[PDB]
Ligand binder design. Structure first.
Ligand SMILES: [Mg+2]
Ligand SMILES: [Mg+2]
Ligand SMILES: [Mg+2]
Ligand SMILES: [Mg+2]
Ligand SMILES: [Mg+2]
Ligand SMILES: [Mg+2]
Ligand SMILES: [Mg+2]
Ligand SMILES: [Mg+2]
Ligand SMILES: [Mg+2]
Ligand SMILES: [Mg+2]
Ligand SMILES: [Mg+2]
Ligand SMILES: [Mg+2]
Ligand SMILES: [Zn+2]
Lengths: 144, 216, 37, 176
RNA sequence: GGGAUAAGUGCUGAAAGCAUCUAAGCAUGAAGCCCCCCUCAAGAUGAGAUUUCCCAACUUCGGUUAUAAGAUCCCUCAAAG
RNA sequence: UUGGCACCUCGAUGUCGGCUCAUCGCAUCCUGGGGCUGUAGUCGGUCCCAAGGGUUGGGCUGUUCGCCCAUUAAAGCGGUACGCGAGCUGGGUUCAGAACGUCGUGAGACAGUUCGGUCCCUAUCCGUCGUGGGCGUAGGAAAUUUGAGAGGAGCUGUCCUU
C-alpha cells in the first residue's frame, strides 16, 4: 500500500543558517553545506522538490587548504574561443575572490539539474564577518 | 587631465613655425556645461557629466529629438543649464576642480597638449572579407572561381565546426574608436574651435570626445 | 649547469644537496654544478 | 641539535624579553625583534638563555637549531653589530658617499646609486673600500650582496666589486 | 610602468658543531603570467548603479480603466542602411 | 617516415601539389632571461627557462622536397582526414585517342616516356559572421553609467652618444 510522504511547497519550511568558514577546510565545509542546501538533513526530504535551507557562509577569506593546494590547485576555464584557456590558482582566487571560491566548491557538489541550480541559488558567501541578511534572522550552524 | 565634447567640422591644414604642412581637424566645441557630478559616495566612482550643444526646450507635441523631453529637461534644469544634445562622462578629470553648471570652454586645452580623441567611425554597411578584414583575393584568371570569397572557415572532422572569431562578411564601421596622442595645434576661443593635428574618427558633424592623453 | 638524470660527484670536492625537491651537485669547480633532470 | 642545545650568553648591557613567540632584544647599538618558532620553549636565565625543543622529530631538531642561531645572532648584533666589507678592483672603479647613499662608478656609462636603509651605515675608505655596518646580520648580508651584484668580479682581471676576503677564480684570457 | 613568478642568482639558516639559496624566514629575477593600453559587455535570470520625468478616477473595493511621462504608426530625409 | 595488422567506410569517407583562411603543440628559428665554456674583446659552442609576437621575394621543376640568386632579427619543426575541392585550381596522377623504347606470335602491356583530354549541387540542422522582434529584470519612462566576464594588441632593424 502506497503511504510514502511527499513534501510540496505548501508544507516545506526553509530556515536560514550562518556557517563560519574560519579555520575550516574548503572541501569538508563545502560537502556539509551542500547537504544542508539539498535538504538531506530533513526527515521530509523529497527528491523532486527543494526541501533544503538557505546558508550564509561568512569569513570565506579565512578558509584553509592542506598540502600545497594554495599554489598547486589550478582552476581552469575556457572562453569558447580558440586557445581560450584561462587559469587561476586556488590561493590567488582566495586572495581576490573568496566568495567565488566557496561558491564554486559548493556548487560542484550539487547536481546539474534545474533543481540543483535553484538549490545552489540559496547560498550566500561573504569574505568578511558581516552579511546583509539580518532581516532573515539566521541561526548559527555548527559543522559536523 | 581635461575633457571636452565637440562636433567634427572637417579637415584642413596649417603652416607651422618652420613652414611644415600640418593637417588638422576642426572641432567645434561650444556650449559644454557640467550637468552632473558623480562621486564615489553616491555613484561609486568619480566623474563629471558634460552636456554639449544646446537643443530646444520641451514643448507639448514634440515629434523629434530636437526638443528636450521632460526627464532630460529636469536633469538639465537641476544643473541650471539648457538641455543638451550630447551627454558624456569624463572619469579622468579632477571632480573637485568643477562645479555643476560650469561652462567648459575650449580654452581649457592649450596648443601643444597631447590628447586622445574618441568617436564613432564612419559606417560602411554590409561588407565582405576583403574590405572588412583586409583578406587576399583569389586569382582573377587562370580558371579561378575564387575572387572575393573569405576562404576556408575551418579544417575537417577535427573540429567539425567553425571556431568563434572566424572572420566573415557583416556590417563594417560604426565602432567606437580612440586615436591616441594627437596634439592640440591651436585653440580659437572666438569661434570655440580646437584644431587637432591629424584626423579623427567619424563623419563630419559626428560627436568627438577630446581627453588629455592617458599615456605619458 | 649540467642538467641530466645522472647527477653525482665528479671530484671529491663535489657536494650532493637537495633544493626544492631536486638533486643537485655544487662544487668549487663551476663545471661540476649539476641539477637532476 | 648541538646548535639548539648550546646556550646563548647575554652581555650585561643586552636585555632579552619574550612576548610568547615574539621576542625583542635591546642593546647599546639598537633593538631587534622577531617571531621565533612557536613550538620552542625558552629557559631565560639572568645571564643566559637556553632553547628547548619538545621532541626529537626532524622538524623539532631543525627549528631548534635555527631558533638558537637566530636568537644568538640578534644578541651579538645588538652587542657588537655586524659589518661586511667590499673592495673595488679596476682602474677608475670608485665609490663615494652622497650623504647617506652610496654612489659607485664601476665601468658603466652611468653611476649607480644604492640608497641606505634603516639601521644600516655605509662607509667609503680610499675611494675603493666600501663597508656596510648594521645590527641585523641578515640586512647587512643583503645590502652587501646588492652592492657586490652591482658588478661582481670577472675572472680575466678580477675587476669589479668583491668581498674583501673573497677568493676570485682567475682565468687566462688570451692565448695564441 | 606595477604585482607575482620561470630557469637562475643570492642573504640569513639549521637538520648535520662544519658546509649548505631551503627546512622555517627574507630578497632578487624573463618579450612570458596578472594588470596597465584599446573595444564589447547587466539575458552578469546574480538581470547592478546614478540623475531626471509621470502619479486618478471608477470599483463585483481582489480589480479595472483609458490616459500621464514616453514611444510609435504614417510622412520629409542621411552622417545610418 | 617506411611498414605490419585488416577493426569503420566499396546502396562512394575525392586522391598529390598550389591558392584562400587559419588553428593548435613545443621537442625554440629570432627576439627576452639564465648556467657552463678550451667565455680576453667582438664573436661563438653547449645546456636550462620561455609559445607573446614575428618568422621574405625570386630561377628550375606538377611538384612536395631539393639546389640556386638576393635578402632578413629570423627565413623553426610538427598536428589539425599528410587541416582546408558542397571555398578555388586541376599542372601530376588514375578512362576512352595517338606515339616512342621495351616485352609479347598475338590481342595487348609497362610505379617507362610523350602530346591531348567534361571538377555538379538554390544551405534544412548544428557551427560561424552580422542584424531585428518577444518577454524577463515586481510601476511606467528618458538619459548617463559600474564592470562580472570576453575579445584585441603584443614583432623587430639601423644609426648617433657613452
Ligand atoms: Mg570569374
Ligand atoms: Mg567536434
Ligand atoms: Mg653520464
Ligand atoms: Mg581476423
Ligand atoms: Mg550512404
Ligand atoms: Mg620548453
Ligand atoms: Mg612564441
Ligand atoms: Mg589533407
Ligand atoms: Mg570539403
Ligand atoms: Mg591534367
Ligand atoms: Mg599502370
Ligand atoms: Mg585539345
Ligand atoms: Zn667537483
Amino acid at each position: 500500500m502506497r503511504q510514502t510522504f511527499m513534501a510540496n511547497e505548501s508544507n516545506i519550511e526553509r530556515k536560514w543558517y550562518v556557517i563560519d568558514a574560519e579555520g575550516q577546510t574548503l572541501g569538508r565545509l563545502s560537502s556539509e553545506v551542500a547537504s544542508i542546501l539539498r535538504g538531506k538533513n530533513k526527515v521530509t526530504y523529497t527528491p523532486h522538490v527543494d526541501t533544503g535551507d538557505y546558508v550564509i557562509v561568512i569569513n570565506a577569506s579565512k578558509i584553509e587548504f592542506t598540502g600545497n593546494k594554495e599554489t598547486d590547485k589550478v582552476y581552469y576555464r575556457h572562453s569558447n574561443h580558440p586557445g581560450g584557456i584561462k587559469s587561476i590558482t586556488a590561493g590567488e582566487l582566495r586572495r581576490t575572490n573568496p566568495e567565488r571560491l566557496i561558491e564554486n566548491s559548493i556548487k560542484g557538489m550539487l547536481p546539474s539539474t534545474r533543481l540543483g541550480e535553484k538549490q545552489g541559488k540559496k547560498l550566500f558567501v561573504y569574505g568578511g564577518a558581516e552579511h546583509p541578511h539580518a532581516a532573515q534572522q539566521p541561526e548559527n550552524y555548527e559543522l559536523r | 587631465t581635461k575633457g571636452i565634447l565637440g562636433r567634427k567640422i572637417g579637415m584642413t591644414q596649417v603652416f607651422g613655425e618652420n613652414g611644415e604642412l600640418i593637417p588638422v581637424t576642426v572641432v567645434e566645441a561650444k556650449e559644454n556645461v557640467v550637468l552632473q557630478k558623480k562621486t564615489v559616495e553616491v555613484d561609486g566612482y568619480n566623474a563629471i557629466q558634460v552636456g554639449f550643444e544646446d537643443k530646444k526646450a520641451y514643448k507639448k507635441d514634440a515629434k523629434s529629438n530636437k526638443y528636450a523631453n521632460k526627464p532630460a529637461e529636469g536633469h538639465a534644469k537641476k544643473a541650471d543649464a539648457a538641455p543638451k544634445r550630447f551627454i558624456r562622462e569624463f572619469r579622468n578629470v579632477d571632480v573637485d576642480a568643477y562645479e555643476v553648471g560650469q561652462e567648459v570652454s575650449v580654452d581649457t586645452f592649450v596648443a601643444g597638449d597631447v590628447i586622445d580623441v574618441t568617436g564613432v567611425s564612419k559606417g560602411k554597411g554590409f561588407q565582405g572579407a576583403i574590405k572588412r578584414h583586409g583578406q587576399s583575393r583569389g586569382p582573377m584568371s587562370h580558371g579561378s572561381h575564387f575572387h572575393r570569397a573569405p576562404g576556408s572557415v575551418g579544417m575537417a572532422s577535427d573540429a567539425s565546426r567553425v571556431f568563434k572569431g572566424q572572420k566573415m562578411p557583416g556590417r563594417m564601421g560604426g565602432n567606437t574608436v580612440t586615436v591616441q596622442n594627437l596634439e592640440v595645434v591651436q585653440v580659437d576661443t572666438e569661434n570655440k574651435v580646437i584644431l587637432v593635428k591629424g584626423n579623427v574618427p567619424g563623419p563630419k558633424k559626428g560627436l568627438v570626445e577630446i581627453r588629455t592623453s592617458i599615456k605619458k | 649547469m649540467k642538467v641530466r638524470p645522472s647527477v653525482k660527484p665528479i671530484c671529491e670536492k663535489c657536494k650532493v644537496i637537495k633544493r626544492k625537491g631536486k638533486v643537485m651537485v655544487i662544487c668549487e669547480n663551476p663545471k661540476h654544478k649539476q641539477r637532476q633532470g | 641539535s648541538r646548535v639548539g642545545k648550546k646556550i646563548i650568553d647575554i652581555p650585561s648591557d643586552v636585555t632579552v624579553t619574550f612576548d610568547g613567540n615574539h621576542v625583542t632584544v635591546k642593546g647599546p647599538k639598537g633593538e631587534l625583534s622577531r617571531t621565533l618558532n612557536e613550538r620552542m620553549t625558552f629557559k631565560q636565565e639572568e645571564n643566559t638563555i637556553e632553547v628547548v625543543r619538545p621532541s626529537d622529530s626532524k622538524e623539532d631538531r631543525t627549528n631548534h637549531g635555527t631558533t638558537r642561531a637566530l636568537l644568538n645572532n640578534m644578541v651579538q648584533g645588538v652587542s657588537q653589530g655586524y659589518v661586511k666589507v667590499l673592495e673595488l678592483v679596476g682602474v677608475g672603479y670608485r665609490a663615494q658617499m652622497q650623504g647617506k647613499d652610496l654612489i659607485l662608478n664601476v665601468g658603466y656609462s652611468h653611476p649607480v646609486e644604492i640608497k641606505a636603509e634603516e639601521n644600516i651605515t655605509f662607509s667609503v675608505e680610499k675611494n675603493t673600500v666600501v663597508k656596510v655596518e648594521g645590527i641585523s646580520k641578515e640586512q647587512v648580508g643583503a645590502l652587501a650582496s646588492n652592492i657586490r651584484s652591482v658588478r661582481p668580479p670577472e675572472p680575466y682581471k678580477g675587476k669589479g666589486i668583491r668581498y674583501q676576503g673573497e677568493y676570485v677564480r682567475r682565468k687566462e684570457g688570451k692565448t695564441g
